């Protein structure tokens, strides 16, 4: 599939089109799109929730949900919480490459 780049308008198909779709999904909220209230992620609503073992069960679900809905060309490998520094939660998201 051939799409356009977000900045600079360039037609890129494989590498950055798969990256500009996933990295947008993690920070786009629900209801921000016009007439599409189910596109986006609950990750903007996961801010200031307490970091529990049931919270990681939700983020690994919402990564698998919001990318499983609207990005079928990405196979998710692992969403591991690797560091809690100063309230900042480091979640490693290693994704496979297709095409």
């Amino acid at each position: 599939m051939i799409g356009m780049d977000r900045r600079s308008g360039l037609p890129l198909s494989g590498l950055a089109h798969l990256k500009q779709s996933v990295e947008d999904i993690l920070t786009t909220p629900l209801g921000s799109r016009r007439m599409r209230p189910e596109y986006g992620s609950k990750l903007r609503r996961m801010v200031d929730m307490p970091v529990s073992e049931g919270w990681k069960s939700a983020v690994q679900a919402e990564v698998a949900r919001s990318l499983g809905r609207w990005e079928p060309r990405i196979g998710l490998s692992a969403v591991r919480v690797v560091a809690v520094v100063d309230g900042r939660v480091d979640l490693l998201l290693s994704g496979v490459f297709e095409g």
Partner: protein, 49 residues
């Protein structure tokens, strides 16, 4: 394409709201004021202001 289908739909709704505002069977609010002022008809006063 979801702005060009939503912002166009807002312009399609402004034309439908303005076409109803010049018809007697559909105008309301301050739009029957302009039909009433042309035919020398004013809205009554039950209790004063």
């Amino acid at each position: 394409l979801q702005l060009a289908a939503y912002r166009e739909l807002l312009l399609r709704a402004r034309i439908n709201d303005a076409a109803r505002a010049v018809m007697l069977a559909y105008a309301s609010g301050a739009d029957l004021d302009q039909i009433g002022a042309g035919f020398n008809v004013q809205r009554l006063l039950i209790r004063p202001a």
